[PDB]
Amino acid sequence: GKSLIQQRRGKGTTTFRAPSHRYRGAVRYVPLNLVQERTLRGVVEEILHDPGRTAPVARVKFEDGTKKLIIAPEGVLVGQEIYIGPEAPIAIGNTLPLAKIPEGTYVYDIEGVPGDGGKYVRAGGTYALVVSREKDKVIVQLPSGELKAFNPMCRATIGVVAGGGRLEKPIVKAGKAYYIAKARNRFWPKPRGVKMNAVNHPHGGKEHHIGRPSTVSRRAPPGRKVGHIAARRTGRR
Amino acid sequence: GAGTAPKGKRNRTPTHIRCRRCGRRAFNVKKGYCAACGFGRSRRMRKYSWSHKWRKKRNLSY
Amino acid sequence: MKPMYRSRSWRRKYVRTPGGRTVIHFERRKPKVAHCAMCGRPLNGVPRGRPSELRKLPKTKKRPERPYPNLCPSCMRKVMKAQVRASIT
RNA sequence: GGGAGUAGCAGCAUAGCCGGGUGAGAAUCCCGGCCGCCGUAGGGGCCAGGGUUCCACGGCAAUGUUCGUCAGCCGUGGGUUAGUCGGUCCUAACCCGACCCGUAACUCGGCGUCGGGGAAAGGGAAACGGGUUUAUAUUCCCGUACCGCGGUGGUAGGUGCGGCAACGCAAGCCCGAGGGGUGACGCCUCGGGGUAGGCGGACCGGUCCACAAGGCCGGCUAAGCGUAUAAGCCCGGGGAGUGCCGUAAUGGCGAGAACCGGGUGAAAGCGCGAAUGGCCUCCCGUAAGGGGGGUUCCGCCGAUCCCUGGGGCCCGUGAAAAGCCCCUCGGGAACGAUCCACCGCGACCGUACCGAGAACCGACACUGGUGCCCCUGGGUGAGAAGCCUAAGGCGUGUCGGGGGAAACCCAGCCGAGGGAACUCGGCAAAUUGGCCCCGUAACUUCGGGAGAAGGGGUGCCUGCGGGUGUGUAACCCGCAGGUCGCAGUGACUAGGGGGGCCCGACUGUUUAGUAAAAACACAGGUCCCAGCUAGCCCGAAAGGGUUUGUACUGGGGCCGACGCCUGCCCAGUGCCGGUAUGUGAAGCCCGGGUACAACCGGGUGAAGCACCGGUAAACGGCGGGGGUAACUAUAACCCUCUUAAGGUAGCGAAAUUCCUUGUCGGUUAAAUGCCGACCUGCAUGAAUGGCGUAACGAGGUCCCCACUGUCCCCGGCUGGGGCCCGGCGAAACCUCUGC
RNA sequence: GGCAGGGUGAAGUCCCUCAACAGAGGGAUGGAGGCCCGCUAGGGGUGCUGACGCGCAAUUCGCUCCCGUGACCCCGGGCUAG
RNA sequence: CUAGUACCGUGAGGGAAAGCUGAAAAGCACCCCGGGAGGGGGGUGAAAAGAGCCUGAAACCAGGCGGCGAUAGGAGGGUGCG
RNA sequence: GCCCCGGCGAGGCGCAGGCAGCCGUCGAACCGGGGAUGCCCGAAUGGGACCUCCCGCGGCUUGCCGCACUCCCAGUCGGG
Ligand SMILES: [Zn+2]
Ligand SMILES: [Zn+2]
């Protein structure tokens, strides 16, 4: 047979690769081996649009001189001072370890293991809520609804991510979707498999119908996982 | 269509230029290697047992 | 017209000659004016030009004599006052 | 060899004639004149590509669709001159090597880092005018300039000042380190100031006309150096709201308006450069050459060229680095420039010509393609439209001659009376057409439909008035009267319209070369996996894509704007989960057997199979014979006969209906058509979506108005071929033959 | 690197008269759109089932027809290989 | 034999044709015609064998000679008599 | 095609039947042996190659030698 789009993406060609030379650099906090117990102070000097991020970024200058990018919280002002460390107050924009953050607080940009730079709750308008503290684990509610435990020495920042409500307004036109997809080299426009030929898709054929259940096993081989992969249920409710 | 008119698009840059090591016009200028001798890719010479061209150059039987 | 001059970074101009030719002259564009580091407002007393034009000027015809010539005067006064008030104790 | 001295040398730009000359020889080569073609390209400039095709002299065996004294052909000799133009520097996307890892190995696959490369239209030091050659010139010559490096000699300064301030100044040298700026940026729209170019009047010098006036030609000024305002930003004074100031527009003000003054700041203009330099012209024997003259003023339009400021849109944010200017620090010396004058040096490569209906690719001196890549005077006019025309180019989109030019064909013009009777089908042709005024249906997502439809008017001359403006400068807007014609958007330019039905929401895309569509895509709806060392994917591995990413995210399917809605079934196939009670391979254990094994019989034994359940915007499915009412009928309903369940709302002879031209009604003189209804739906039906739907369509289909040579019924004209004449000169085909 | 010329008139910003419990009516500014007309240049290929069909051409020509500020057209440098 | 050469293809790659005067150049001195290539007379040589060169077949073409040749019917031949 | 040593013994100047000339008896041509010169690219190696061409370091005096990667012996020199 012939190949699927999901199999051609793995090769790593220009048709599928992200254009990250266009973006502002990655976003990471500060390494522990240089913020051990110091509680660094910085000033916000710019707020910027980032094409690969979905959230606005801010440029912070620290005392030594080092400049860095952070993910911006709703409300942060140009000319405002932020604090990074263990003896930092509880104020929107400051980064502390989870063991020092009360219950009921709204939190973003949480590390998975301490020192990893930030992994969780990064998108526009997202927030996490601190649920429980113990001496071995801190339980947090993630935006998917799921409860997860972290090490109490993992770092998080206080507040909500900026850029929410993005999907309140319709895209309306195909051309606007063209530009939105081109910005991150997403595959657009998308084809249907039932109007492909049989050489091209497990659906496919001149009568344009799936002729077998669209639920497919978790153990099926590649080239065959299309439709509803390992579905617990299907339908309306 | 696919015939006479697209043949007009032949004033671009050439795929192959003259090769510095072997004297043939087989040096691929975007990739940086020769399609005949391997210059730019191999310290050794390209030579295959299914090919006749080196034998012809040396007046050899196949 | 050569391809290098079909490029719209050359600001073409038409000029009539002592022999009656009416030829085209090509020049490069002028860079914009210096801006303040804090506010991004334009600066005064700083001339515009390309490097060759600026190298045919002396030092004192390139910037104002007062201190911090890279700042607008308001921001300069801010800086001097803050220095003063921190030089009290 | 026959075909054959035949076809072709027409069609998209129909071009030659007269006189003179050369020469063995002239439709086809040269000079002059007349007549013509292109004229937002057939003209001008120049990439890639080609490579001597460039120039002069000499030639005509071959090439040139004819001829040839001609040539992009043949021969003989020549021709490309740079400190300032481009390449040699910087980085972009990207590529390579070493180390390292993988591979049985490699000229194979990877890889963070280190280094190296990567743009003749991106960034990026410095030159303009005129002449000279057969052929080169921002490259040679003349004139007048600039850059970098290196010297010499003086000075500013080190060790100095004017301004409340914004700021104004020659305002010290060497080496190193930081910081700021510039480089350095998208799409759309608007104002202000300038320039090239064009137009009108006066004067001079010339030229074309029975005269006549009048028409036409020329009337110039580079780089560089020096010189300042506009917007905008800013500094001082001043002290405001039943508000005042301003813009094309948005706007501004106790977080300091008006108003007085000032500072910095572009493109330009002006002066020098600079003149018997360039152009025009007037006299003499004309070889050298000779000689004398003019080179002036106002006014209008002005860009798609240059500068400068405002406003708007983004689920979209529109490069980087070298280089260059400034400031502050640290370390050194006692000197000494970013100012003035002078002096010397400035390596390598490219530089001819075409740049296309004959110098490139297509086998060709090919109506194709590459390149329309950059640029273009006057009139009418909204106009880079079409038509005429200047400059510049051509008469070589390389065979000609005869002809009141036979039939017949290609491309065009007209046609009495009828007006689609033609034909599968109004195919094709005709009709309408610009601007101003009036007036404008259903339906509608209230935005549209809509230029709906439909009606009136339009030229020339003579006079009056308006707007802006200083203007009998220039542009634009109205009125009245007289007058000619079959006709006044008089040529060119320049919509035919309306009403029903089916599909698809729309703009968009598609089978290069028989299908442009009802097929694809689309916004939007809804389902699935996944908390990241994830989910999905490439690969032999090493490693890798999504990922400079983290659930308002990434991946996987189905339907397909909008409005009203989306019924029942988990028995089957599939997916998910749960209990183990069974079964369950190797291995382990027990026993026998074998002086040891092979072997034989039992137990345990995971995933999976089985068993219990959940799931249909998962694949898919959604039952007949029977009887009955106040008489002929049909049966709400009642007996009923089985499954997981037994087709709900809707639509329905349908792009789905076999009998089929179903039946009834409307449309016609006449209807196997179209529309509307009926329902025994062979074989409709709800996200393999159902029913509707304004706007949209080179989609399919029926009707009405107008119009016409489509037809009754065919006729006459115009150019080009066909035919005769002179020249060049093939092919397909061919057993022999041929009532 | 590029796209003659013309039309329509979205938001935003207002003015006047009469009134003010509510409102009614008349004038402008401004310049949006996968808007409209358009052989501008360019791009495409609906019909005549036209010419040609040992062609000018191994897919061209002419008349007619479609798009023409955008999901548009083109150029130099690179990447994906049976 | 001036052959892995000319030549074709973006490229891997594909790939021809083409031998001989005479013992000796003794390779046609001289005249007429022709714009010329050439023709005709003359010469060298045992012989033109003349570089368009040893021999020089067939198919095909032109002229000369002979027989037939415009009332005529069969695959082009066979037998017999003129 | 330049030099030398031996041989051969008068002509020679490539395939290649020309016009002008030159070399050779002081021993050529030719044959055997041995030397010198030997542009650019190429393993290609001082550093770079979209055109077999470009761009540098030193040190000695224009003229000269050296300057790649991987490894052995070493050792702050060098020899392989
Ligand atoms: Zn090679
Ligand atoms: Zn400032």
Q: What is the DSSP string of chain A?
A: ----HHHHHTT--TTTS--GGGSPPP-----HHHHSS--EEEEEEEEE--TTTSS-EEEEEESSS-EEEEEPBTT--TT-EEEESTT--S-TT-EEEGGGS-TT-EEE-B-SSTTS---BS-STT--EEEEEE-SS-EEEE-TTS-EEEE-TT-EEEES-BS---GGGS---SHHHHHHHHHTTT---SPPPSTTS-TTT-SS-SSS-S--S-SEE-TTPPTT---SEET-S--S--
Q: Does residue C36 have a known ligand-binding role?
A: yes
> Which residue's entry shows tokens 């002592």?
C18
Provide the terminal-to-terminal Cα distance of chain A, rounded to the nearest Å.
37
**Could you tell me how far CA B13 lies from the centroid of its own chain?**
16
CA/C1' separation B11–E51 (Å): 33
Check whether residue B15 has its CB closer than 7 Å to nucleic acid strand F.
Answer: yes
Query: How far apart are alpha carbons A41 and A109 in whole angstroms?
Result: 19
Ligand nearest to the CA of C39: 2
Q: Which two tokens stand for residue A136?
A: 């071995």
Q: Residue-wise over C35-50: b if at least 16 C-beta within 10 A, else e?
A: ebeeeeeebeeeeeee
Q: Does residue B34 have a known ligand-binding role?
A: yes
Q: Find out whether B20 and B27 touch, Cβ atoms under 8 Å.
A: yes
Q: Find out whether A141 and A128 touch, Cβ atoms under 8 Å.
A: yes
Identify the experimental approach.
cryo-EM
Peptide bond into A189 cis (omega under 30): yes
Ligand nearest to the CA of B35: 1
CA/C1' separation A10–D544 (Å): 8
In this structure, the strands spanning A57-62 and A67-71 are: antiparallel
Check whether residue B19 has its CB closer than 7 Å to nucleic acid strand G.
Answer: yes
Residue A226 identity (one-letter amino acid) = V
Question: In angstroms, what is the span from residue B54 Cα to ligand 2's centroid?
Answer: 75
Residue A33 identity (one-letter amino acid) = N
Ligand nearest to the CA of B42: 1
Q: Which residue is nearest to nucleotide D338 (CA to C1')?
A: C58
Question: In angstroms, what is the span from residue A228 Cα to ligand 2's centroid?
Answer: 60
Which nucleotides in chain G lie closer than 7 A to a protein CB? Answer: 41-44, 49-52
Nearest Cα residue to B18 out of B43, B36, B41: B36
CA distances from A117 to A30, A59, A97, A153 (A): 7, 17, 12, 13
CA/C1' separation C13–D221 (Å): 17
Which nucleotides in chain F lie closer than 7 A to a protein CB? Answer: 4-5, 10-15
> Which residue's entry shows tokens 């604090």?
A83
In this structure, the strands spanning A81-84 and A138-141 are: unpaired
